[PDB]
From a paper:
In order to visualise the structure of [name]-[name] domain without this unnatural ligand bound, we created a new fragment of [name] that differs in its N-terminal His-tag linker sequence. Due to difficulties in crystallization, this fragment lacks the non-[name] region and the TPR6 motif. The structure of [name]-[name][A1-B5] is composed of 10 α-helices (namely A1 to B5 helices) adopting the common [name]-[name] structural motif. However, in the crystal, the [name]-[name][A1-B5] molecule makes a tight interaction with one of its symmetrical counterparts. Through a 2-fold axis, both C-terminal helices (αB5) bind into the N-terminal part of the groove of the related molecule, covering a total buried surface area of 3196 Å2. The N-terminal part of the [name] domain consisting of A1, A2, B2 and A3 helices makes extensive hydrophilic and hydrophobic interactions with the B5’ helix (K405’-F416’), as well as with the last two extreme C-terminus residues (G417’-S418’) from the symmetrical molecule (hereafter denoted by an apostrophe). The phenylalanine residue, Phe416’, located at the end of αB5’, is fully buried within a hydrophobic pocket formed at the interface of αA2 and αA3 (αA2/αA3 pocket) and composed of residues Asn259, Ala262, Leu263, Arg266 from αA2, Ala274 and Leu278 from αB2, Asn302, Val305 and Leu306 from αA3. Specially, the side-chain of Phe416’ occupies the same hydrophobic αA2/αA3 pocket as the Trp207 from SKIP-WD motif. The [name] domain closure of [name]-[name][A1-B5] is certainly the consequence of the tight crystal contact that drives the C-terminus of the B5’ helix to lie into the groove with Phe416’ occupying the αA2/αA3 pocket. In [name]-[name][A1-B5] structure (this study, “IN” αA1), no hydrophobic pocket is found at the αA1/αA2 interface and residues Pro210 and Leu213 from the αA1, as well as Ile209, occupy this space.
Numbering used by the authors: 209 to 418
The structure:
């Protein structure tokens, strides 16, 4: 991300995190206006700026306002960076999240799957950004009740995370809790209780010393 933009990012998110949207929002909109003046609309820095203001709106739960901006950012990024660029998968995942926040889980799912395929096609089927996207897809299938698909995506992500980061990785514990719940939802008690035992024991192990 360009340097003068992330400084603005830090400043605006600081304001947002104090609930001071009356300052965060004008700063983003003016910065967007001034960016457009310098480089015209179809420029990566404009998409980046739109993503910052979409985050601020999301932080206020203005979900449809945020999607409008990211839909604009997505078209910019596809034209300027390409249909398979990682930033396009980033913008697709955020749109999947915003549609899901409006109960529009059937619109969300293609967007999230595309972001997954983009990340596999760039980072390889084993990258942990793929696991992260898998966790995001799993959560969306859960809100549609597709528990066999949830369990598949969580297993894939647990395997990426645990074979590629530590067994003591925050995400490994996070993905194990998610999958454990999903087993219990399905009635697969002995699979659910196998995972729960691991979580407890490893937690006890972490606090205890050598």
């Amino acid at each position: 991300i360009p340097a003068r933009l992330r400084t603005l990012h830090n400043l605006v998110i600081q304001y947002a995190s104090q609930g001071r949207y009356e300052v965060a929002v004008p700063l983003c909109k003016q910065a967007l206006e001034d960016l457009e003046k310098t480089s015209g609309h179809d420029h990566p820095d404009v998409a980046t700026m739109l993503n910052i203001l979409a985050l601020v709106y999301r932080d206020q739960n203005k979900y449809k306002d945020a999607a409008n901006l990211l839909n604009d950012a997505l078209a910019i990024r596809e034209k300027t960076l390409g249909k398979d660029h990682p930033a396009v998968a980033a913008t697709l995942n955020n749109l999947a999240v915003l549609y899901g926040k409006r109960g529009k889980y059937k619109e969300a799912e293609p967007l999230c799957k595309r972001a997954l395929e983009i990340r596999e096609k760039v980072l390889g089927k084993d990258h942990p950004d793929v696991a992260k996207q898998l966790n995001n897809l799993a959560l969306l299938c859960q809100n549609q009740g597709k528990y066999e698909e949830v369990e598949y995506y969580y297993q894939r992500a647990l395997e990426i995370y645990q074979t590629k980061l530590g067994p003591d990785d925050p995400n490994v514990a996070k993905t194990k809790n998610n999958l454990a719940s999903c087993y219990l939802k399905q009635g697969k008690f002995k699979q659910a209780e196998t995972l729960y035992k691991e979580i407890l024991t490893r937690a006890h192990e972490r606090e205890f010393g050598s």
